Amino acid sequence: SMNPPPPETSNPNKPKRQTNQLQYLLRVVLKTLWKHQFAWPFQQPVDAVKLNLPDYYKIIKTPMDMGTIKKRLENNYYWNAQECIQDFNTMFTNCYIYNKPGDDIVLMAEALEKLFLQKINELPTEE
């Protein structure tokens, strides 16, 4: 089976804005996770073809990854900070759905999620 197309990163029909919360999500939250030592499994969509995981997209129907989130922020895809925070949480939830306690990917996701929470708990004030 094929990979699905990656999630849309630009919608030409959506209005666009810059906010301090969106700046924080890209330049502080995403950036901090992007340069972490456990970021590499989460920097792009799971390639179930090359990795030979034919059941991944039978189990994961809302795939999400930091490469997609990064592009969404850079393309002003998100109007509300909540839309971006939901994508991060979907990415982590997918990991814990597909994988088991003691898996190396689970320990990596847990460390990244701890850091995500520390950064998102300092989300700046809304305009």
Ligand SMILES: COc1ccc(S(=O)(=O)N2CCOCC2)cc1NC(=O)c1[nH]c(C)c2c1CCCCC2=O
């Ligand atoms: C054995 O697994 C890999 C081996 C090499 C590479 S790779 O970085 O060398 N490379 C990626 C681009 O295609 C060429 C190979 C990646 C991965 N894997 C991931 O990235 C990844 N991420 C998640 C979220 C996941 C996974 C796979 C584990 C279970 C599902 C699962 O939850």
